[PDB]
């Protein structure tokens, strides 16, 4: 289970439907993808050696996305999917592009980062809403079996990942836009000296600072929520979710900046 709140008993089973896929793609930082711009600093026409929270060059990713229809499996809410956060993660997220009429909608899996996932602890939630990325860090009453839904196409389940009838305490609550037409979003989520940091990009590029949040406590777990739709499967549209994740470590990189301040290259 994720949290301990019984939000639902509708269509729960114990089926072993999948395990996390290992990517045939691997981390290649030679053009700065898998790096980040350092906070609000600009470096121009230079190389620096920088020690930061970076993926290993040549590492695989695990696809942690889960797509449901009516049923959820209890095995989706356990290891290997419920994951130790350690120092942090780099993720490569497929933006799943869906059409209702001719009109485009963007979907992808929510990620939650936390420890015990109960309302005496803060859970960081990063959720898309069709070109708006909502980010919060609140004392959420997380469900046992949390999930999100297609807003775009139908869902035979209602959205249910927390149960708070009046708003929980929040340390952070902000929205960020992203380009709905992109194929990929990238994130770094990491922690250092009791402070969480988030970075993103909506292109094959180094990630840009979203926010930082002091917690004092360690985040110990993360989980990518199942998303349920009457769509995004081989018998209906051949579209899919993918939420690829690879671990970060405290690691020295060479970073190469051009005269515009873009990271053009990096070395592990
Ligand atoms: C922060 O997070 C915590 C932990 O998740 C939340 O605390 C839980 O809150 C829920 C909802 O109030 C509690 O569930 C309720 O417990 C009552 C007491 O349980 C005893 O009595 C029942 C018989 O009534 C026995 O079966 C049981 O074994 C216990 O001996 C129940 O009376 C409630 O019943 C209602 O809901 C159920 C399930 O939907 C229905 O079947 C019933 O018909 C009835 O409608 C209910 O189960 C839960 O016990 C709390 N857990 C703890 C550890 O305290 C906090 O609410 C949350 N805080 C905030 C601010 O959101
Ligand atoms: C994490 C995972 O394993 N995810 C896969 C999912 C589950 O294995 C399945 O849900 C069972 O999960 C549990 C917990 O029991 O199967 C999917 O494929 C199905 C066939 O496997 C799909 O064709 C569905 O077939 C139906 O017969 C049915 O209900 O399964 C009718 C339904 O209308 C139709 N869904 C549509 C149209 O989207 C799906 O989607 O659900 C592809 C997902 O990638
Ligand atoms: C951040 O984005 C979310 C999603 O768009 C906003 O939530 C909506 O807020 C309006 C307020 O009138 C509600 O009517 C909607 O029901 C909400 N939508 C969803 C999907 O939750 C939120 O207000 C935005 N701003 C902040 C600061 O969080
Ligand atoms: C969860 O809540 C539902 C709805 O009230 C109830 O029927 C079910 O018995 C509960 N299950 C558990 C494991 O508490
Ligand atoms: C689920 O199925 C896979 C493939 O057969 C297997 O490796 C795994 O051990 C099974 N059990 C669980 C709980 O994942
Ligand atoms: C960038 O740095 C190189 C190497 O020092 C130098 O040749 C070049 O003239 C510099 N260009 C600018 C615009 O500073
Ligand atoms: C979803 O929400 C509606 C409106 O509250 C409710 O009627 C329905 O029973 C809920 N559950 C499902 C599985 O549709
Ligand atoms: C949005 O993404 C598409 C596909 O990658 C790209 O062609 C387009 O130029 C982008 N637009 C903006 C405003 O970023
Ligand atoms: C999905 O792709 C397979 C393989 O190309 C094809 O046989 C099937 O007809 C496709 N179905 C849909 C709904 O596109």
């Amino acid at each position: 289970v994720i949290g301990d709140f019984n939000c639902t008993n509708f269509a729960i089973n114990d089926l072993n439907t999948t395990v996390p896929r290992i990517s045939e793609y691997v981390v290649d930082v030679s053009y700065g993808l898998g790096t980040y711009y350092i906070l609000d600093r600009v470096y121009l026409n230079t190389t620096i050696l920088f020690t930061g929270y970076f993926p290993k060059s040549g590492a695989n990713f695990r696809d942690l996305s889960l797509k449901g229809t009516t049923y959820l499996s209890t095995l989706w809410y356990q290891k290997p999917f419920l994951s130790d956060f350690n120092n942090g993660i780099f993720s490569r997220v497929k933006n799943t592009k869906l059409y209702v009429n001719k009109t485009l909608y963007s979907e992808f899996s929510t990620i939650v980062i936390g420890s015990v996932f109960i309302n005496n602890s803060y859970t960081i939630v990063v959720q898309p809403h069709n070109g708006v990325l909502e980010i919060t860090a609140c004392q959420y009453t997380m469900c046992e079996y949390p999930h999100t839904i297609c807003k775009s196409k139908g869902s035979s389940r209602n959205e249910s990942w927390h149960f708070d009838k009046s708003e929980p305490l929040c340390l952070f609550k902000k929205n960020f836009t992203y380009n709905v037409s992109t194929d990929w979003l990238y994130f770094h989520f990491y922690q250092e000296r009791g402070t969480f940091y988030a970075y993103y990009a909506d292109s094959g590029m180094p990630t840009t600072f979203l926010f930082s949040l002091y917690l004092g406590t360690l985040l110990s777990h993360y989980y990518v929520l199942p998303l349920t739709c009457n769509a995004i499967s081989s018998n209906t549209d051949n579209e899919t979710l993918q939420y690829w994740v690879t671990p970060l470590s405290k690691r020295q990189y060479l970073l190469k900046f051009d005269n515009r301040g873009v990271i053009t290259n990096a070395v592990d």
Side-chain angles (χ1 to χ4, degrees):
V1 295
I2 306 302
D4 72 355
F5 199 91
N6 183 8
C7 294
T8 192
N9 73 327
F10 172 61
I12 307 300
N13 70 34
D14 303 320
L15 267 59
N16 185 2
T17 69
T18 195
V19 292
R21 289 159 285 279
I22 304 303
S23 60
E24 183 178 1
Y25 179 81
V26 296
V27 175
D28 174 11
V29 308
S30 61
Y31 301 104
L33 189 163
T35 74
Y36 52 82
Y37 293 98
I38 298 92
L39 302 169
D40 60 351
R41 293 180 181 177
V42 180
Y43 294 95
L44 300 182
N45 191 32
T46 194
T47 52
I48 73 181
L49 288 168
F50 180 77
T51 185
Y53 289 91
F54 293 123
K56 270 179 57 65
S57 183
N60 306 86
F61 299 74
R62 285 152 60 228
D63 175 21
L64 298 178
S65 67
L66 292 166
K67 188 276 179 194
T69 307
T70 47
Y71 283 90
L72 307 172
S73 173
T74 64
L75 299 185
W76 293 355
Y77 300 105
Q78 299 182 4
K79 284 175 171 284
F81 308 98
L82 174 62
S83 296
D84 301 81
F85 184 74
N86 299 311
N87 303 117
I89 57 166
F90 178 63
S91 66
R92 173 176 86 127
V93 185
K94 176 173 160 70
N95 175 28
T96 296
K97 282 150 51 173
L98 305 182
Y99 304 90
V100 178
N101 289 293
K102 304 305 300 182
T103 45
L104 173 62
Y105 294 75
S106 161
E107 305 287 4
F108 58 88
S109 301
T110 294
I111 187 169
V112 307
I113 308 166
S115 57
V116 291
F117 301 109
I118 61 156
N119 66 25
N120 72 359
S121 70
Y122 290 95
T123 300
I124 292 148
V125 181
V126 176
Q127 172 162 8
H129 298 283
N130 187 36
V132 173
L133 187 75
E134 176 176 42
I135 304 186
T136 59
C138 309
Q139 297 201 141
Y140 285 122
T141 305
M142 299 293 296
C143 301
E144 285 183 325
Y145 310 128
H147 74 91
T148 63
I149 71 171
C150 277
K151 298 305 203 300
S152 315
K153 298 296 185 76
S155 172
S156 44
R157 305 188 73 83
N158 295 322
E159 181 159 332
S160 187
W161 57 266
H162 72 295
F163 186 84
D164 292 293
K165 281 286 183 178
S166 57
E167 296 92 327
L169 299 184
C170 299
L171 299 172
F172 186 77
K173 176 160 180 178
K174 188 169 176 180
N175 289 353
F176 305 88
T177 49
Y178 70 90
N179 179 5
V180 166
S181 302
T182 56
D183 294 335
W184 301 99
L185 287 87
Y186 297 89
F187 302 86
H188 295 73
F189 302 117
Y190 73 83
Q191 67 187 338
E192 184 177 38
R193 290 184 295 286
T195 305
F196 179 76
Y197 302 84
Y199 304 70
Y200 87 136
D202 58 354
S203 283
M205 69 174 278
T207 63
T208 300
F209 178 84
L210 283 166
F211 79 105
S212 178
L213 169 61
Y214 182 78
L215 297 174
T217 58
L218 294 175
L219 301 162
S220 59
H221 293 283
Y222 73 95
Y223 182 62
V224 178
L225 303 194
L227 185 167
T228 65
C229 305
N230 304 346
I232 56 176
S233 68
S234 64
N235 82 296
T236 185
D237 59 20
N238 273 311
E239 196 62 48
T240 186
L241 305 175
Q242 301 179 2
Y243 196 108
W244 297 103
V245 187
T246 197
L248 301 176
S249 53
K250 173 59 70 77
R251 177 164 284 284
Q252 189 183 61
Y253 270 35
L254 187 78
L255 302 175
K256 175 77 169 71
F257 294 88
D258 74 6
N259 69 319
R260 308 172 295 159
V262 176
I263 298 162
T264 64
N265 307 90
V267 187
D268 184 346

